[PDB]
Design a protein around this ligand. Sequence first.
Ligand SMILES: CC(C)(O)[C@H]1Cc2cc(/C=C3\OC(=O)C(c4ccc5c(c4)C[C@H](C(C)(C)O)O5)=C3O)ccc2O1
Length: 428
Amino acid sequence: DAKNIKKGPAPFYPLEDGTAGEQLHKAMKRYALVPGTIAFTDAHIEVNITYAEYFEMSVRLAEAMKRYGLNTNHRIVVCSENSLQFFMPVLGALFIGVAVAPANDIYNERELLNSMNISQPTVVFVSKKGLQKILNVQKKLPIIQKIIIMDSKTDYQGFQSMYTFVTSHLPPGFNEYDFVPESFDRDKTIALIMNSLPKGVALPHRTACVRFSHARDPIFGNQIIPDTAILSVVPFHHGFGMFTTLGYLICGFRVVLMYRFEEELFLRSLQDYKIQSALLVPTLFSFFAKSTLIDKYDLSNLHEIASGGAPLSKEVGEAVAKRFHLPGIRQGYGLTETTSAILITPEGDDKPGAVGKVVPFFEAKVVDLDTGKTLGVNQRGELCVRGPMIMSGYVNNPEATNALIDKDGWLHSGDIAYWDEDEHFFIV
Ligand SMILES: CC(C)(O)[C@H]1Cc2cc(/C=C3\OC(=O)C(c4ccc5c(c4)C[C@H](C(C)(C)O)O5)=C3O)ccc2O1
């Protein structure tokens, strides 16, 4: 019964060809050619970095990694708190087809070791505060040949920074604007290995390309408008942070980041940066349902709040929307294994407690927990989705992959849901 399979509509703009690296490179080069266009802002230290700076450093890192000897057979780890530098090695690696494994920066040595035993990186990019943990991990994982310090200009404790690493490897006369990213099969070449003991979730370049279609979709994402700023406190090494931020770079937005939540800084940032959209996780929603400071700030520019990371209760969402003077909350539902959200609230068509509608290129159904039958409108069962953002599999764990994804390509989410007469989905 096809009528009970909910399908996303066609994307507003056709899906572009090219790897995720090629698409990011093309967009970022465009924004780079306009001086002063801000890519990231660190709300804590107040420093801005422009698309020109970001584009040039990411391309220099790409070329330096290529000359050092990395290619599609290798992986890198990026282990850092949210920062201005976080996406430099991410973009550089995407530009040359090297898979990136972001490691949670609050993991201890044991958890890092398990994570990197799965991803098996050749080079680790780490912030200064993570260096000791990586050195302890490297003791057990000799495959790590090289450690590069992200948030330093000069060498740091005998290790190269991204800047000195680049100088060591760039050819004379290197031209960042002549550089061309690598081309490769985007279904076969892994872009990210995300953590989900945790497993490693392999995401081909294809899944990011589809994400970039959603991110700028006028219905399922944000319309590309000049001078748009987002406030993001969500960890970049988690899918909600990783894939919203890459999407924002495609859109040329200003991404104001925080690496630690604080109430006054968060609200003052919304006000002073004239933020249009802010990203929260459910426990920060619960926090703002308790906040009374919100009405002391001028939030007249705020258009939306998005919640991701885990389903949000209906009542908490309604409380927060009211405190912020918004008509509703921009919800979505995703898993690490689906790259990002594959149900998203359509712009202007929020419905309290709903996680939204099936995104372009996807299908979703709910199945009876007994009969396995596809269910109709307003009936509760297991949410199952199928589409090109689904992971290629858990790394070196085909049994775990097969337990989650069936022979027809349906991923079984483990969550109970239903959809309504407008094809809005609700998580129960
Ligand atoms: C407008 C706009 C911003 O473009 C769109 C894009 C968008 C995404 C979401 C929600 C999510 O996006 C995500 O990626 C995840 C997610 C990603 C990984 C993941 C989990 C959730 C749960 C699971 C766990 C480990 C439990 O955290 O892993 C979301 O919930 C909500 C609103 C929204 O507006």
